[PDB]
Every structure is written in structure tokens, then in C-alpha cells.
């Protein structure tokens, strides 16, 4: 709820034709603008050329936004989501005037689903905190995904980077007799892939041993 | 050459078909046996089969092992060095009697060369190792390493260097002591597999 209201008060800049792929066989592009009665998805044409093949259309949808703005989005059909060719995108106001131009590569705009099954335990010997987790559901090329872990003290900024492929993390500099909340996020790795960090996964809290 | 006389003595182990690839576009297979007078390449049949492909015969060879046994080796032609698909190998005597049967995957029997140009400098009271990967090898960034640290004067410690990293930064090392380092490499998963290479020429440094 807090984060909800936190978003409402935020500050956005200029509108952008934003695009992303969740699994490497889809693509959703969108943008947002203010309302205007008589302005529905039919007013815009989202066309897209793709590696010398003919331009094609994408049916635009309209959805409401918590901040009172409307967003228009198109999701490309599976067959047109090749991961390494220059997809050109074009959007025009029925009045002829162009709204956006953007040439992207699907592999360059990855935004995965957050990781799952984050579980936490203490190492049998040391007693340190050992973190394990599984990669985002139904997503390919797992060994190419790097992560980042956030460690909060029930403190200060502590975020551990995790070499791509590895879904385990053992922490050792933690105070004893303390509750720590962890949460991990994912990202496609270079150089083949590029994109954005995912949302955080459901968190887990855990006490540390009395003395270490 | 003491290492040389040592290998002559060291106890045996069961006969076995062994295969390995060096530069990931080559494959050698072989076995050793009692050098009984008479035998030769002609007395044995060595053929392989890549899936969805025909059985082919391999031109066997024979050479004396340093220890006295005979090594019969076949070396697949370049074009048949396809990695990810299952390779089958049947070595049977001319009499039909079966000898060996091993199904492998080329990418899973890599015995790289040992690293080169290893160097150990000084820092923050710390020691920094740096080295090159086995010369003329592709997929460089798929090779993980391991460093051997053995303190001179009447010992040891070992570090697992992660993939594609050709530099190690050693910390905890007792003051005035003479250390002798070394490094060895092997192909790393998910794609590859294999065995540890030999060591690289070592380097000593007095702290």
C-alpha cells in the first residue's frame, strides 16, 4: 500500500514507447498519456517491420492507470519475436502525424518475472545464513541470469551481486541474534542479452544464532 | 625425470577405452594392453557412430607406451568431431569377441592444455596472481581454474578460480615464507565437462 501511494506521488518525465520481453518469445510495447474523450485505441496504428519482412499491424488496447492516465499497448504475436534482428516499430496518429519511432532488439529489452522459492537457513557448521532460490518460472537460458540480493536489518545498504547461473548465496558478516529480511532480483547477462532488473521476490525473514 | 621413473612404478588399474579432446575440434581414443607378440591394428575393429549417421571405421594405430604396454589409438577425422550429439564406440577383436563399448559426448571429455605465462606480483600486503589460458583454445570464457599454493620449507592450500577469470588475488599468506604457485584448467558447465589439465610451470616468490 505504501509503495502504491509512493508511486502516485512520484515524478515521471517525457512519455516513451517502452517495450519488453518476459520470456524470449513475446514482446509487449506500450506508452501512456492523459485521457481525452473520443480518444480510443482505434486512433492509433502500431505497425512493425521486422528484418526485411513486410510491415504488419498490431491491435492496440487501452487500459486505465492508478494515476488517472491511460496506457496503450500492443503485444506482438509469438512468430514475430525473433531475438537478434532489428525490429522497427512505428506508431501514428490517424491524422497522419507520427507519435513514435524506435528500432529495438528483443534480446536487449528483457524484464523477467521475479525469482521464486526463496528459502533461507543457517549453515550446519559456521551458522552463517545460506540463501537458495529458483529462477523465474517458465523462463529459458537460466545459466545466463545474474542476480542481486538485498539484506535488510530489522541498518544500512547491503546488496550482494551473484555471478550468473548461481542460485545460492552464503552470507557471513551478519550480526548474531538479529532478524534479517532478504529478497533477490534477476537480470539477463551480457553480452548476448540486455535489459532491466526484475521486481523483487516475496521476502523471507530469519533470526541469526545468539553468538558468532 | 624423477616424476618419470615414478610413473613406471605406480600400480596399474583395469584396461579401459579412454577418449579426450584438446581444442574442442579433435578427438582421440585408445587403450593399452599386454604387448603380446603377433597383434597389431589389423587384429582389431574400431568403429563409431554419431546419431542419425552411418557407422564408420577408424584407422587404428599402435605405439609403445613408456611403460612397455602397447597403445592402440584411433583419431576421428575432423568432420566427425561433432560435440553435443551422442557418439558410440565399439572396439571388438577380429574374432568378433567384444572388447569395449562406450557412448560419449565430445564436449564432455575435454582435457585442455595447462595454462601459461603465470605471474605473481605484490600489492596492501597482498599477492596477485595473473595468467594466460591454454594457447590456441576457443570458448576461453568457459574455462574455470584452480590454483595450487604450497609453502616451501617443510605444505599446501587450494583455491577454486571461477569461470573465465584469469587472475587471482591471494590474501592470507604468512610473512617471510617462500610460496610456490601453480594453476590448472578444465572446461566448465553447463555446456562442457572433462578432466583437469596438468599444472603450468610454477613460480616462487619470497614474501
Amino acid at each position: 500500500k505504501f509503495e502504491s501511494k509512493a508511486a502516485l506521488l512520484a515524478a515521471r518525465g517525457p512519455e516513451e514507447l517502452l517495450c519488453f520481453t518476459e520470456r524470449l518469445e513475446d514482446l509487449v510495447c506500450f506508452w501512456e498519456e492523459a485521457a481525452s474523450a473520443g480518444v480510443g485505441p482505434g486512433n492509433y496504428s502500431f505497425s512493425y517491420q521486422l528484418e526485411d519482412e513486410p510491415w504488419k499491424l498490431c491491435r492496440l488496447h487501452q487500459a486505465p492507470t492508478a494515476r488517472g492516465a491511460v496506457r496503450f499497448w500492443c503485444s506482438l504475436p509469438t512468430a514475430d519475436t525473433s531475438s537478434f534482428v532489428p525490429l522497427e516499430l512505428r506508431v501514428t496518429a490517424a491524422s497522419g502525424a507520427p507519435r513514435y519511432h524506435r528500432v529495438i532488439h528483443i534480446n536487449e529489452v528483457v524484464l523477467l518475472d521475479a525469482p521464486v522459492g526463496l528459502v533461507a537457513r543457517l549453515a550446519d557448521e559456521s551458522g552463517h545464513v545460506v540463501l537458495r532460490w529458483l529462477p523465474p518460472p517458465e523462463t529459458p537460458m537460466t545459466s545466463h541470469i545474474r542476480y542481486e540480493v538485498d539484506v535488510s536489518a530489522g541498518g544500512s545498504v547491503q546488496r550482494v551481486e551473484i555471478l550468473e547461473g548461481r542460485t545460492e548465496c552464503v552470507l557471513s558478516n551478519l550480526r548474531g541474534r538479529t532478524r534479517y529480511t532478504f529478497a533477490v532480483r534477476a537480470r539477463m547477462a551480457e553480452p548476448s542479452f540486455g535489459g532491466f532488473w526484475s521486481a523483487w521476490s516475496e521476502p523471507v525473514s530469519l533470526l541469526t544464532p545468539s553468538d558468532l | 625425470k624423477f616424476e618419470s621413473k615414478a610413473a613406471l612404478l605406480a600400480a596399474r588399474g583395469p584396461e579401459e577405452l579412454l577418449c579426450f579432446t584438446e581444442r574442442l575440434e579433435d578427438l582421440v581414443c585408445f587403450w593399452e594392453e599386454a604387448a603380446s607378440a603377433g597383434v597389431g591394428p589389423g587384429n582389431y575393429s574400431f568403429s563409431y557412430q554419431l546419431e542419425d549417421e552411418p557407422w564408420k571405421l577408424c584407422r587404428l594405430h599402435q605405439a609403445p607406451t613408456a611403460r612397455g604396454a602397447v597403445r592402440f589409438w584411433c583419431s576421428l577425422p575432423t568432420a566427425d568431431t561433432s560435440s553435443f550429439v551422442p557418439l558410440e564406440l565399439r572396439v571388438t577383436a577380429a574374432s568378433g569377441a567384444p572388447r569395449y563399448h562406450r557412448v560419449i559426448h565430445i564436449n564432455e571429455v575435454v582435457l585442455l592444455d595447462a595454462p601459461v605465462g603465470l605471474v605473481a606480483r605484490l600489492a596492501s600486503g597482498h599477492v596477485v596472481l595473473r595468467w594466460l589460458p591454454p594457447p590456441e583454445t576457443p570458448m576461453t570464457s568457459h574455462i574455470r581454474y584452480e590454483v595450487d599454493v604450497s609453502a616451501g620449507n617443510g605444505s599446501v592450500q587450494r583455491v577454486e578460480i571461477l569461470e573465465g577469470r584469469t587472475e587471482c588475488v591471494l590474501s592470507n599468506l604468512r610473512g617471510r615464507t617462500r610460496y610456490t604457485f601453480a594453476v590448472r584448467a578444465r572446461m566448465a558447465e553447463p555446456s562442457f565437462g572433462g578432466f583437469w589439465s596438468a599444472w603450468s610451470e610454477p613460480v616462487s616468490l619470497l614474501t
Partner: peptide, 16 residues
């Protein structure tokens, strides 16, 4: 699918 191959550092894949 793509036409990949080996190389110095890692996989090289041109659009097949």
C-alpha cells in the same frame, strides 16, 4: 534457431 559456432571467448551466433 540460429547458426552458432565457437570462437575466442564464447558462442558466436549470426541469424541463420
Amino acid at each position: 534457431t540460429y547458426s552458432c559456432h565457437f570462437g575466442p571467448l564464447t558462442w558466436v551466433c549470426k541469424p541463420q
